[PDB]
Amino acid sequence: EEKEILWNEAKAFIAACYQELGKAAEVKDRLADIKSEIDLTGSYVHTKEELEHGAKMAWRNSNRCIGRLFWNSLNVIDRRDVRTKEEVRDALFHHIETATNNGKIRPTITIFPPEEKGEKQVEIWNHQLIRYAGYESDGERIGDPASCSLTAACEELGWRGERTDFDLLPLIFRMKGDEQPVWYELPRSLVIEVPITHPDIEAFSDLELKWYGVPIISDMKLEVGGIHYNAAPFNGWYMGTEIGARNLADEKRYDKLKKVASVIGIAADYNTDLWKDQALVELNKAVLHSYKKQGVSIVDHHTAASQFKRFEEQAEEAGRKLTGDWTWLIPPISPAATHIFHRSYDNSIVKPNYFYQDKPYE
Amino acid sequence: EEKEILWNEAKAFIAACYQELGKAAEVKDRLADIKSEIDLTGSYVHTKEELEHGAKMAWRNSNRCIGRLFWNSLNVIDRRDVRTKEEVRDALFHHIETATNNGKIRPTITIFPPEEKGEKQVEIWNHQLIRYAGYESDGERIGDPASCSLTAACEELGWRGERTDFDLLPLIFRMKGDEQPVWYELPRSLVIEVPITHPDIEAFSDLELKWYGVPIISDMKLEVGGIHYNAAPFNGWYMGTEIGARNLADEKRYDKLKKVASVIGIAADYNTDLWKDQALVELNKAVLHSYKKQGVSIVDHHTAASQFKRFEEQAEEAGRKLTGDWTWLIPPISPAATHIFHRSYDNSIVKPNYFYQDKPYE
Numbered sequence: 001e002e003k004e005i006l007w008n009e010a011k012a013f014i015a016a017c018y019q020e021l022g023k024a025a026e027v028k029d030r031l032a033d034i035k036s037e038i039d040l041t042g043s044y045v046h047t048k049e050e051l052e053h054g055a056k057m058a059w060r061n062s063n064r065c066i067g068r069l070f071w072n073s074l075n076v077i078d079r080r081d082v083r084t085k086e087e088v089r090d091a092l093f094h095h096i097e098t099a100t101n102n103g104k105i106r107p108t109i110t111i112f113p114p115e116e117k118g119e120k121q122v123e124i125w126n127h128q129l130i131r132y133a134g135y136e137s138d139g140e141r142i143g144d145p146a147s148c149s150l151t152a153a154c155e156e157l158g159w160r161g162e163r164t165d166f167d168l169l170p171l172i173f174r175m176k177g178d179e180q181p182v183w184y185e186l187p188r189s190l191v192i193e194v195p196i197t198h199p200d201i202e203a204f205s206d207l208e209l210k211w212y213g214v215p216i217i218s219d220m221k222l223e224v225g226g227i228h229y230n231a232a233p234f235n236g237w238y239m240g241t242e243i244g245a246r247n248l249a250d251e252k253r254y255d256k257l258k259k260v261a262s263v264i265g266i267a268a269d270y271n272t273d274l275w276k277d278q279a280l281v282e283l284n285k286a287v288l289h290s291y292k293k294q295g296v297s298i299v300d301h302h303t304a305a306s307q308f309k310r311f312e313e314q315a316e317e318a319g320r321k322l323t324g325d326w327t328w329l330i331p332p333i334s335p336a337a338t339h340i341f342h343r344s345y346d347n348s349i350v351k352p353n354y355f356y357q358d359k360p361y362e
Numbered sequence: 363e364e365k366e367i368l369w370n371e372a373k374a375f376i377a378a379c380y381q382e383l384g385k386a387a388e389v390k391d392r393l394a395d396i397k398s399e400i401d402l403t404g405s406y407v408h409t410k411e412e413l414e415h416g417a418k419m420a421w422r423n424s425n426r427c428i429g430r431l432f433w434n435s436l437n438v439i440d441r442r443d444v445r446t447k448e449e450v451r452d453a454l455f456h457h458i459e460t461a462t463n464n465g466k467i468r469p470t471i472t473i474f475p476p477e478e479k480g481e482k483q484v485e486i487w488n489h490q491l492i493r494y495a496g497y498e499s500d501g502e503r504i505g506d507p508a509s510c511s512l513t514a515a516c517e518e519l520g521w522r523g524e525r526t527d528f529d530l531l532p533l534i535f536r537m538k539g540d541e542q543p544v545w546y547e548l549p550r551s552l553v554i555e556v557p558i559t560h561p562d563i564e565a566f567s568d569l570e571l572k573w574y575g576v577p578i579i580s581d582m583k584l585e586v587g588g589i590h591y592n593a594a595p596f597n598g599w600y601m602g603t604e605i606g607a608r609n610l611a612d613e614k615r616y617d618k619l620k621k622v623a624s625v626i627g628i629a630a631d632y633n634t635d636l637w638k639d640q641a642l643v644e645l646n647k648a649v650l651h652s653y654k655k656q657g658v659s660i661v662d663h664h665t666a667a668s669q670f671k672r673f674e675e676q677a678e679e680a681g682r683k684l685t686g687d688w689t690w691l692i693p694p695i696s697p698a699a700t701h702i703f704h705r706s707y708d709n710s711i712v713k714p715n716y717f718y719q720d721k722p723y724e
């Protein structure tokens with residue numbers, strides 16, 4: 001059963017992959033070797049070209065991603081050679097450095113050894129390589145509430161945050177054969193942060209808001225032709241609304257809209273004043289302005305939507321079915337001002353793709 | 363087959379309806395009479411209580427409606443007695459008057475005779491009883507483009523618009539037995555209009571924007587226990603975003619965002635300035651302010667969402683399944699600032715309900 005699913009996913013992937021690479025004639029022989037390799041070993045190993053292209057296809061198939069136009073320029077780092085926690089750590093440090101690229105963000109994925117018998121070689125606990133801790137204790141809310149459980153897990157392992165609203169969580173991952181994960185503090189020189197200012201409201205800096213430059217999702221599983229890369233952190237650059245409309249605005253996150261309303265000089269008393277909507281816009285303008293000012297890559301949601309339209313058009317020209325999750329593709333501000341809002345999308349799941357997996361903590 | 367579907371829908375409706383009315387014991391006898399009435403006549407007639415409650419249930423089941431909290435206070439006007447186009451016209455004029463209620467809008471439905479053999483007694487052509495005409499001719503865009511086809515249909519019947527951006531379309535409907543519909547100009551004294559001004563931007567009036575007070579959907583079919591009320595115009599009051607974020611903002615409607623950006627003193631050159639988002643907010647503030655200032659009922663989307671949350675809670679307390687269309691329930695501005703955005707809904711279709719039907723024109 002195991003070696004049957006694998007073989008089926010493998011046949012489908014290699015055919016489609018090699019077809020796109022213009023290697024359709026090499027399929028039959030590559031499929032022969034794979035069939036033999038599965039029978040004998042219970043698995044198979046991707047060539048560098050397959051792995052690289054598989055990661056790109058997986059991005060292209062991510063229904064919830066608005067940034068998919070640039071799927072083919074993904075920078076793929078092959079780290080299937082890693083065997084030690086020192087190597088994992090340095091691969092993670094390197095990923096951060098090369099993706100950040102002094103602010104000129106390179107979309108990048110580092111790929112670690114895949115599961116074998118469903119047994120993980122490396123198990124990364126971070127949701128993102130760079131994220132802020134969160135504390136909920138006795139009425140005191142500090143930091144990012146989304147990070148409360150992971151934070152408490154780290155602190156259970158000997159780490160201690162300074163309890164500012166922006167403590168950088170340590171990298172934390174577990175190697176096959178260890179009962180506990182290990183954790184390593186992040187070198188500050190590797191992490192770019194953007195203080196949030198407003199282009200024309202000077203008081204906005206009184207909020208003392210900031211965010212990190214690069215969102216590096218590190219807890220999703222990459223699936224390519226039956227092979228499960230459970231550890232494969234990837235990053236793009238932020239769309240402004242992710243920070244301005246959700247991370248800093250959600251009541252269950254940093255919940256900053258009342259303070260934004262105050263510094264921008266408007267009352268926050270009446271729903272009919274639309275003070276939340278107005279606060280949202282100024283905060284989102286502030287986020288875009290601040291990232292641009294520091295030279296850190298970011299895209300506004302209109303530009304991103306225009307890009308996604310091109311992705312839609314390219315999909316049709318290439319004869320590929322387009323798949324998408326309308327509920328995630330629409331931006332959380334002014335969605336009706338994008339074309340996305342006014343059409344529908346097929347939410348079917350196509351592989352290769354990125355998937356959720358269970359949290360080891362919690 | 364016909365008298366079978368009818369009987370089945372009837373059994374389900376009467377049971378549920380009488381149960382909610384506390385008349386569960388009268389069910390068996392009422393069901394007996396209905397069964398006899400169907401066999402002999404090919405149909406059956408709702409009592410006033412059934413019709414009234416059916417219309418309320420249909421509102422309650424409208425997955426796309428955020429205003430459903432007030433389902434039980436719907437004012438139901440029974441006009442199944444109408445036989446002439448003069449009576450239809452006066453019933454439509456009356457509906458407008460009583461729903462408007464000097465600005466203190468009463469949610470209201472006027473119910474006309476139902477289809478018999480699928481044959482319509484009355485066929486209303488308007489999408490809303492009060493709407494603006496639209497003209498598309500030789501580069502010239504005038505009025506509401508959503509009304510272009512109906513407008514051209516009216517003008518094909520002898521009506522002529524003045525070709526302002528806000529020509530009121532005539533009422534237009536067809537009686538069973540006539541090849542053509544008839545049309546009647548709307549008395550201006552019956553129609554409340556709201557000039558759009560801004561609470562603190564005086565130049566906003568230079569736009570010369572306005573809208574009508576009461577949205578009265580007149581082209582949907584009401585289905586109650588197998589009986590098809592194809593003509594049953596209903597109204598609530600507007601949610602501000604319907605006017606500010608869609609009717610006046612959509613590129614395929616009045617497309618006013620550039621002119622809004624100009625009068626509010628901001629540039630409309632860069633996506634990163636979020637000028638559309640900012641323009642949207644000021645226009646939507648202007649809409650709410652203007653309706654409030656004239657004493658015409660309106661609800662902002664935050665208040666409406668809070669009300670819908672209560673509807674959700676009442677549904678659970680009453681033991682009723684909740685159904686909803688997430689894609690329509692989320693407001694087109696700041697959707698993430700509402701609870702609706704952060705939960706999901708079952709989009710199943712429950713009857714009684716309101717349904718689309720084919721346009722006789724176009």
Ligand code: HEM
Pocket residue numbers: 055058059062064065066067068070074107108109234235236237238239242299304328354
């Ligand atoms: C290049 C810049 C990129 C931008 C601007 C972008 C934009 C976005 C946004 C806005 C979301 C929604 C996230 C949320 O609502 O929290 C998203 C989701 C997603 N993106 Fe991208 N993205 C980019 C690059 C990438 C890359 C490089 C990958 C992987 C190779 C990727 C895969 C995904 C996936 C898998 C999701 C959905 C995650 C989930 O279901 O939770 N994206 N993207």
Ligand code: HEM
Pocket residue numbers: 417420421424426427428429430432436469470471596597598599600601604661666690716
């Ligand atoms: C009391 C005030 C009401 C408010 C504020 C309200 C609000 C809304 C809104 C905002 C929509 C979405 C419309 C759009 O996006 O264009 C909607 C849809 C709808 N509402 Fe309501 N509504 C109200 C009363 C009513 C009443 C009285 C009925 C009927 C008895 C009704 C039935 C519906 C239906 C059927 C739809 C969906 C129509 C479609 O699919 O095109 N609503 N409502």
Ligand SMILES: CN(C)Cc1cccc(NCc2ccc3ccc(N)nc3c2)c1
Pocket residue numbers: 127215217235236237238239242356
């Ligand atoms: C934590 N998950 C189980 C749920 C969840 C909640 C909130 C956000 C996400 N994914 C965010 C996400 C994922 C991939 C991204 C890629 C690029 C980018 N700019 N943002 C991205 C953002 C996922």
Ligand SMILES: CN(C)Cc1cccc(NCc2ccc3ccc(N)nc3c2)c1
Pocket residue numbers: 489577579597598599600601604718
């Ligand atoms: C014209 N239809 C085929 C599609 C369509 C497009 C745009 C809007 C609608 N329905 C709008 C609608 C329907 C019922 C409403 C009830 C109350 C209210 N305030 N707005 C309401 C608005 C329907």
Ligand SMILES: C[C@H](O)[C@H](O)[C@H]1CNc2nc(N)[nH]c(=O)c2N1
Pocket residue numbers: 327328329703704705706
């Ligand atoms: C329940 C709700 O549909 C769901 O949580 C979604 C809605 N759309 C979203 N869209 C984005 N981009 N991100 C999110 O976290 C969500 N939340």
Ligand SMILES: C[C@H](O)[C@H](O)[C@H]1CNc2nc(N)[nH]c(=O)c2N1
Pocket residue numbers: 341342343344689690691
């Ligand atoms: C295609 C798209 O999903 C669809 O046209 C919907 C989206 N959500 C909407 N929501 C509302 N309230 N009104 C609309 O007309 C639409 N359009």
Ligand SMILES: [Cl-]
Pocket residue numbers: 215242247
């Ligand atoms: Cl994030």
Ligand SMILES: [Cl-]
Pocket residue numbers: 577604609
């Ligand atoms: Cl409308």
